[PDB]
Amino acid sequence: NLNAVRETMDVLLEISRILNTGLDMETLSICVRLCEQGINPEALSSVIKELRKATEALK
Amino acid sequence: LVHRILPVAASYSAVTRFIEEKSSFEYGQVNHALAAAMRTLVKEHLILVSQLEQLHRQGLLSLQKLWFYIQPAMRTMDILASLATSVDKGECLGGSTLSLLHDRSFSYTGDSQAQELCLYLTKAASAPY
């Protein structure tokens, strides 16, 4: 199963790349560790959409 | 008034001669980043001159306006004509220049026009060290 979770982490990368999400590998690793707890993803939407917004507000 | 504007070019002549000499290896590996942060400042001067050229073609650059423009930049360019002529004189490399340039931000701590340049120049000269 330890080999399987690595393969499922690598198959998970492409659908976060081709859907034009805000995630790359690091945010994927953070968010996959957060989702294993049981945290609601509809709330994580806003914290990612605001981390990417607040830097553009400074420029 | 020309004699008041004329020290700018004299405080430019021994700044390009800083860039085109202090880029050499022999002056050390601190004079490299020293003269890549005195190269940036000469590019800033080149930006100013271009804007003023666009003004002058429309009959809209005159001696008074130019004199107003350059007066903040005689606390910018003339400062470069002093550090260049103290670091080059004698043999100053590495840490000896960097003490001499920590000595020259306590000779500019009340102007604030020159002080920003001193802080930038010694923030670039501290990087290889």
Binding site: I15, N20, T21, P41, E42, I48 | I47, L48, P72, A73
Partner: protein
């Protein structure tokens, strides 16, 4: 509403805009994604809000054998878009290179140096 169905609904939207084999790879992916589920529900809310040749396409002179498919000769016009996207990138570059430096050759004075702002 399942998890693997939500990837299929966007496979369709892949297939609308061309790119057949990309959707054909996606459907090879959906059988192993569910024969982690809470991540893809995060992927649909970020779907399109993020930050922004080949010798096997229209050639038939390679291969140990080729299937014979007759004349088509109306995909040679979308082999010109295959080049047109390249040369329209290399002219958009030249528009954003003349702009960023004519904006510094011409501006109000005192805005190209913040030390003159003091």
């Amino acid at each position: 509403l399942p998890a693997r169905n939500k990837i299929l609904m966007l496979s369709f939207d892949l297939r609308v805009g061309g790119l057949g084999p990309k959707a054909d790879r996606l459907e090879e992916l959906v059988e192993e994604l569910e024969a982690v589920g809470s991540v893809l529900d995060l992927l649909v809310q970020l779907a399109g809000s993020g930050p922004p040749r080949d010798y096997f396409l229209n050639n038939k002179h390679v291969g140990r054998n080729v299937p014979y498919s007759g004349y088509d000769c109306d995909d040679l016009s979308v082999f010109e878009m295959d080049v047109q996207s390249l040369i329209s990138r290399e002219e958009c570059l030249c528009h954003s290179m003349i702009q960023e430096t004519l904006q510094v050759m011409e501006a109000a004075p005192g805005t190209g140096l913040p030390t003159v702002g003091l």
